[PDB]
Amino acid sequence: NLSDIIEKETGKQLVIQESILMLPEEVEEVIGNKPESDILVHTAYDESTDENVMLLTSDAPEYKPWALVIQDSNGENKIKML
Amino acid sequence: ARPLSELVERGWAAALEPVADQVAHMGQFLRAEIAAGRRYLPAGSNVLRAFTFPFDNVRVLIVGQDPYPTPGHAVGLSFSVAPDVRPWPRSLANIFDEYTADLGYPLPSNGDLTPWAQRGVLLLNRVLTVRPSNPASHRGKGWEAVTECAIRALAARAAPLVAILWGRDASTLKPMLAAGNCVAIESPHPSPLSASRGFFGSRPFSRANELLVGMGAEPIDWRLP
């Protein structure tokens, strides 16, 4: 899966439940890196750490990793650019 | 099947009449997709389910994107999942928090949104189908033309409409409902990455209602536990 690259960068067997598509303008504000073109925000949930695990990739055909975000019970994000 | 009237509530028949050729085409695409060995997720019966509830009874539009890419999740309606779906889409989780925050209500027992649908909240995705595990795989594949006509038709009616538009993808449809009797309320997407950026606190369920009332229409119930 594309979820394998999640398992790679974090080591957690999680299922991607949603891929929301957003514009660079939207993603930039939160991560502080304006990306090339639109991004898909694949969000899986870790039901044990209560973390939202996010994988941001390039649009549909080629799902190119771009950044990874882990978001805790509070809302702070450990952002790792990919 | 084939003829529109046999496929959607009628009234929706009228609505989508101009995209009849366009929708009929979508069929042989899907059929062609199975023919080529791959399957699509939304599920035969449910693909057009969005348009099974009365056209004249819609008061609130919640436009989504394409369907949830994982099997057994997508159910023919924006954002909603199937009741057995346990750890639910984080977008939906967030939507729900703002939902308990906004209205007095307790957290829903499941992400089954059917009741909203049958109360005049149109949960229309912009792209009605999608290849399993391959998000956005049916974008520009013909569907937008349909969902777009869907919307224009709603806007044209004498009846008042509130469209709530989560994410910028949605916003592109703002112009598409000339705000005569239509009001659009936009906000960042309920996705975790963006939710706290201005979705949370947007109070869309009540605002939607108050807007409806402002225009001499009945409020939606919401409320699903």
Swiss-Prot record, chain A:
Which InterPro entries does its entry note? Phage_PBS2_Ugi, Ugi
According to the record, the signal peptide region is none
Top-level taxon = Viruses
Q: What does this protein do?
A: This protein binds specifically and reversibly to the host uracil-DNA glycosylase, preventing removal of uracil residues from PBS2 DNA by the host uracil-excision repair system.
- Name this protein carries in UniProt: Uracil-DNA glycosylase inhibitor
What species is this protein from?
Answer: Bacillus phage PBS2 (Bacteriophage PBS2)
Swiss-Prot record, chain B:
Q: List the Gene Ontology MF annotations in alphabetical order.
A: uracil DNA N-glycosylase activity
This entry carries the following GO cellular component terms, namely: cytoplasm
Q: Where in the cell is it found?
A: Cytoplasm
Which Enzyme Commission number(s) are on file for it?
3.2.2.27
What highest taxon heads this organism's lineage? Answer: Bacteria
InterPro entries (UniProt xref): UDG_fam1, Ura-DNA_Glyclase_AS, Uracil-DNA_glycosylase-like, Uracil-DNA_glycosylase-like_sf
Main localization category = cytoplasm
Q: Which GO terms describe its biological process?
A: base-excision repair; base-excision repair, AP site formation via deaminated base removal
Active site located where? D66
Catalytic activity, as annotated = Hydrolyzes single-stranded DNA or mismatched double-stranded DNA and polynucleotides, releasing free uracil
**Which UniProt keyword terms apply here?**
Cytoplasm, DNA damage, DNA repair, Hydrolase
What HAMAP family does the record point to? UDG (MF_00148)
Recorded family membership? Belongs to the uracil-DNA glycosylase (UDG) superfamily. UNG family.
Tell me, what does this protein do in biology?
A: Excises uracil residues from the DNA which can arise as a result of misincorporation of dUMP residues by DNA polymerase or due to deamination of cytosine.
Q: What is this protein called?
A: Uracil-DNA glycosylase
Q: Which species is this record about?
A: Mycobacterium tuberculosis (strain ATCC 25618 / H37Rv)
Which lineage ranks, top first, belong to the organism behind this chain? Bacteria, Bacillati, Actinomycetota, Actinomycetes, Mycobacteriales
